[PDB]
């Protein structure tokens, strides 16, 4: 059941600075998330704010 | 040398959706980036778009 499409989730192996991870999951922690999740929002907001067309 | 912490790369991975692996990576293409590094980037404006403090 649901081999393709609507899965809705792939593999990205993201590598960012130590600093970062720090602080972001820390927010994370505030927050119940991971930073894998604010990375994800990041993006959300990130084509919300770069367009505003959203197709 | 730079044992531990300046090494300043962690991993993490992210899961979203092949909507976005369309038209992110279609855009990763033009900008010739892995979405890997757009999440991450879409951090640093997320941070910047919400606080003023830039760190």
Do not use: F
Request: net charge positive.
């Amino acid at each position: 059941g649901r081999p393709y499409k609507l899965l809705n989730g792939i593999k990205l192996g993201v590598y960012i600075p130590q600093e970062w991870h720090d602080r972001l999951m820390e927010i994370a922690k505030e927050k119940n998330l991971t930073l894998s999740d604010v990375c994800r929002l990041a993006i959300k907001e990130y084509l919300d704010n770069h367009d505003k067309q959203k197709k």
